[PDB]
Amino acid sequence: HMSIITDVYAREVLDSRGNPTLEVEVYTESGAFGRGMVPSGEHEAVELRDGDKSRYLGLGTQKAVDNVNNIIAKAIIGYDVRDQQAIDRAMIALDGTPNKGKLGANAILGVSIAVARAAADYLEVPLYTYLGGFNTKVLPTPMMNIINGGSHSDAPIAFQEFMIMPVGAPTFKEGLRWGAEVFHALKKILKERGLVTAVGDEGGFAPKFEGTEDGVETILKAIEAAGYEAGENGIMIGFDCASSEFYDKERKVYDYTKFEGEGAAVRTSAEQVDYLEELVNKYPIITIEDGMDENDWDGWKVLTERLGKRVQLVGDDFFVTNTEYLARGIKENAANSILIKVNQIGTLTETFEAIEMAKEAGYTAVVSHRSGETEDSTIADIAVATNAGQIKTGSLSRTDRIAKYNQLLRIEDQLGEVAQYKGIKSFYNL
């Protein structure tokens, strides 16, 4: 039979940081072919690294490759390419450990994506429709990393990302246009101001700003210089605080002096909500990723209680694309959104279960990328697959980001008049 998987093959390659990762290629009997590349950035499914400090600083992925070829290959070769779920469970079972540590979630995912991309090819249909069935129409309102703080910046800013969103644009094409044009308008401002216009891991700037206020304030300046409004009818802001980064576990506080230098405001759970609340009043923020630590459940509860109805609140690391942690989130009214990083969980099925569960709680599934990305564009299709309405794939520079933006332009076009773009209406959690 022609649908049947006859080859599965991995090799080591580079992600967009200059670090190894892997691709898996799957052939069917028929000639059909798919290529699954894997990205890379605690409760998060393990990615296998060689540890050999004399190869790529021990970030080699030969371990992973050798598991795809010598173990997963033999097990999987034989299945029908379309048994997307039979296969993902095979690998999971085969692996046997809860956080995919035996074979590694890079190995597993790789295969799993390859097989889908192969099956979509086999049936001679786009990836989003294979994945999603026939009712895939919605193009994601994207949230575009434009300024960086935290580890990435040297400026006195703790929040890791500052993003934007063309919620007010009619089509995703225009939305991207909008988004780009501001990025160039900002880039200009940053030159006139004498700050660094080189870009970090997600294609954003990370300039030496005065602090968090100057940070937002200029993103707004940019928006206006481009000639868009700053609201529901224009462009709006978001954060990834990555607060788990500046949380002191023993003092159980949000230590801003780590990133904003001595004489900076150390905050408790309650104060932290109050700051974020301030920010939201002051500004047209619409989303806030990791407002809190990944083990600060009480905090999360309160945060979401306060802004839960004004502002979309996304648990990134607080859920790790993982049903177990998310169900608890739902139960305890812990967020109203979730960041869906496919490699964080390891297979597409588990990824879809996660995206599914979240919808039925009135939680938005934000499909996201990882810092270490690839020429792959699978996640773009995943946001259309599920009509998720949202996507975080980075800034408007570096093909690691723009591959997806293009990929989505492709999907917009291929969908002709069928395509929708929900802008602000994608926030069914509000």
Author numbering: 0 to 40, 45 to 433
What does the paper say about this structure?
SEN has been proposed to contribute to the virulence of GAS by serving as a plasmin(ogen) receptor. Although SEN has the ability to bind plasmin(ogen), it also catalyzes the conversion of 2-phosphoglycerate to phosphoenolpyruvate as part of the glycolytic pathway inside the cell. Alpha-enolases are typically homodimeric, however they have been found in some bacterial species including GAS to be octameric, consisting of a tetramer of dimers. Each subunit is made up of an N-terminal domain (residues 1–143) and a C-terminal domain (residues 144–435).
To provide the foundation for understanding the structural basis of the virulence function of GAS SEN, we determined its crystal structure at 2.9-Å resolution. The asymmetric unit of the crystal contains two dimers, with each subunit exhibiting a kidney shape. In the crystals, the octamer is made up of a tetramer of homo-dimers and consists of two types of interfaces. Dimerization of two enolase molecules involves the ‘major interface’, whereas octamerization occurs through the ‘minor interface’. Each major and minor interface buries a total surface area of 3648 Å2 and 2580 Å2, respectively (calculated by PISA), with the octamer having an approximate diameter of 153 Å and thickness of 54 Å. BS1 is located in the minor inter-subunit interface. Plasminogen BS1 is located at the C-terminus, while BS2 is located on the catalytic loop L2. Wild-type SEN binding to immobilized human Glu-plasminogen occurred at a slow rate, and the dissociation was similarly slow and did not go to completion. In the presence of wild-type SEN, the initial rate of tPA-dependent plasminogen activation significantly increased by more than 20-fold when compared with the no-SEN control. The initial rate of phosphoenolpyruvate formation was calculated to be 131 nmol/min/μg of recombinant protein.
